[PDB]
């Protein structure tokens, strides 16, 4: 014999988006290349690097990325041309 149970009403979750570092420290990069995919301002951009529509960090010039500390707690990302 059996007993009937159901109604979990929990089984859904969205398709998870790729977020994170897509270039490493010291990488040569190209003009227009993304460096970090964040969601909200985790890292403020520095020189030669912009901020996208959905807070994306993109390299304006081809160069070498460097990650640095900004202030007490925050990070900064920058591009140095070679």
């Amino acid at each position: 014999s059996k007993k009937g149970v159901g109604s979990t009403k929990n089984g859904r979750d969205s398709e998870a988006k790729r977020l994170g570092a897509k270039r490493a420290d010291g990488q040569f990069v190209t003009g227009g290349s993304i460096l970090y995919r964040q969601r909200g301002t985790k890292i403020y951009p520095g020189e030669n690097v912009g901020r996208g529509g959905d807070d994306t960090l993109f390299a304006k010039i081809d160069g070498t990325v460097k990650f640095e500390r900004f202030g007490r707690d925050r990070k900064k990302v920058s591009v140095y041309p070679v």
């Binding site: 059996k2 007993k3 149970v5 159901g6 979990t8 929990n10």
Partner: protein, 135 residues
């Protein structure tokens, strides 16, 4: 029957218990306490029965302490069902006793009656225990 009067989510994982106790290792408030020396779960029925076996024998001796609250719920599926199709309903409250934790602290009571009384309360628990006194 130590009820947490409100709880954030009603179903957590059972978790795993590794290593020694985080805090409350030694006697702090009373003079003599009871310490557990291996890991297991502990539930409110046990804690209440232990406090009865302690305090009712102890009568007018002094006062007692508990430094364990069975905050974490544990669930169970209803009896005689096929497993699966959603987590079961919660039905009880449990606490973790990592080895090294002190269970109960006694106060205002001479050493030997507290000794035999903690020994009596030990059999209510499902764990191997050790007497520890204050330094």
């Amino acid at each position: 029957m130590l009820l947490p009067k409100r709880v954030k989510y009603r179903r957590e994982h059972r978790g795993k218990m590794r290593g020694r106790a985080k805090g409350g290792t030694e006697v702090h408030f009373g003079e003599f306490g009871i310490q557990a020396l291996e890991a297991s779960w502990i539930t409110n029925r046990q804690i209440e029965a232990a406090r009865i076996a302690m305090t009712r024998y102890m009568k007018r001796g002094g006062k007692v302490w508990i430094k364990i609250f069975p905050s974490k719920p544990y669930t169970a599926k209803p009896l005689e069902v096929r497993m699966g199709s959603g987590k079961g309903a919660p039905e009880g409250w449990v606490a973790v006793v990592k080895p090294g934790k002190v269970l109960f602290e006694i106060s205002g009571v001479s050493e030997e009656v507290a000794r035999e009384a903690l020994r009596l309360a030990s059999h209510k628990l499902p764990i191997k225990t050790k007497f520890v006194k204050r330094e």
